[PDB]
Amino acid sequence: HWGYGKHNGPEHWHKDFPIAKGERQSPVDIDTHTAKYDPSLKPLSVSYDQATSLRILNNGHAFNVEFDDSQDKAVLKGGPLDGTYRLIQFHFHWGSLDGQGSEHTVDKKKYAAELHLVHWNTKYGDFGKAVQQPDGLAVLGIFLKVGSAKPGLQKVVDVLDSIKTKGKSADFTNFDPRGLLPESLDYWTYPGSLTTPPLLECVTWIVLKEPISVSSEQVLKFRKLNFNGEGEPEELMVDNWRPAQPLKNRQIKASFK
Numbered sequence: 001h002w003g004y005g006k007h008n009g010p011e012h013w014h015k016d017f018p019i020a021k022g023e024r025q026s027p028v029d030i031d032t033h034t035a036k037y038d039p040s041l042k043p044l045s046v047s048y049d050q051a052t053s054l055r056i057l058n059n060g061h062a063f064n065v066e067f068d069d070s071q072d073k074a075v076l077k078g079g080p081l082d083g084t085y086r087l088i089q090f091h092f093h094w095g096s097l098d099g100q101g102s103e104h105t106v107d108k109k110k111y112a113a114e115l116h117l118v119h120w121n122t123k124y125g126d127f128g129k130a131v132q133q134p135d136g137l138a139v140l141g142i143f144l145k146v147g148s149a150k151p152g153l154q155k156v157v158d159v160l161d162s163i164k165t166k167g168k169s170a171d172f173t174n175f176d177p178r179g180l181l182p183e184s185l186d187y188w189t190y191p192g193s194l195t196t197p198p199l200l201e202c203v204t205w206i207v208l209k210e211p212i213s214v215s216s217e218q219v220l221k222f223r224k225l226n227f228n229g230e231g232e233p234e235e236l237m238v239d240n241w242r243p244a245q246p247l248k249n250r251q252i253k254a255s256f257k
């Protein structure tokens with residue numbers, strides 16, 4: 001089955017998911033000189049005051065912090081979006097070293113990791129219907145660099161030992177995702193896809209310009225996770241990122257600048 005290796009990693013995905021070679025795949029390199037400042041773009045509105053985190057889960061590709069998305073609670077709007085998009089989960093992608101790990105790149109720079117806050121368009125009623133639509137999802141992407149710790153990250157890191165292996169889940173209530181955001185909401189945006197199989201071309205990407213800083217110790221705990229399940233040989237969960245894909249006929253827009 002797909003994963004991040006030589007025999008089942010990103011260069012193999014297209015055999016099961018031919019959409020991998022499509023016209024609006026993610027991630028991309030954000031060439032900052034070529035991105036268009038669009039004065040028509042709005043501030044992004046991130047309303048996470050009532051977010052209800054529920055569970056943290058090791059799905060075997062990354063970990064997901066899940067939210068109760070059955071009410072209008074944690075929503076993304078504005079920016080390039082029409083409508084309202086409700087938060088369902090976040091997860092990260094990260095490297096084996098600090099010099100790699102992000103999916104998007106900025107003038108070919110790789111960050112140590114990238115946070116994805118996944119939201120679905122309420123006009124489609126649920127996530128599963130949204131992913132079948134070209135405007136179904138909005139992903140807020142945030143780069144991580146290694147430096148000073150991110151205090152609002154520590155609750156996530158400290159639960160990771162309880163979800164080491166694939167399949168594990170732990171109650172994870174009262175986690176506030178506002179503690180993962182940078183100061184600025186300046187962003188780039190473009191139409192793209194999920195970066196994991198099934199690679200559906202349903203995402204408006206919103207990538208923040210300002211990274212957050214996390215400590216070496218915090219990203220070292222992400223790298224202790226395992227891609228395998230309990231009782232199977234250890235394969236550390238590192239380098240769970242898909243490389244930049246061809247931009248093809250797309251324009252990246254800047255909200256700033």
Ligand SMILES: CCCCNC(=O)c1cc(S(N)(=O)=O)c(Cl)cc1Cl
Pocket residue numbers: 059061064091116118137139193194195196197198203
């Ligand atoms: C079958 C699930 C395999 C793991 N991937 C995800 O959880 C996932 C990743 C993105 S990403 N990496 O594009 O943000 C999105 Cl938008 C939506 C989901 Cl569902």
Ligand SMILES: [Zn+2]
Pocket residue numbers: 091092093116195
């Ligand atoms: Zn992701």
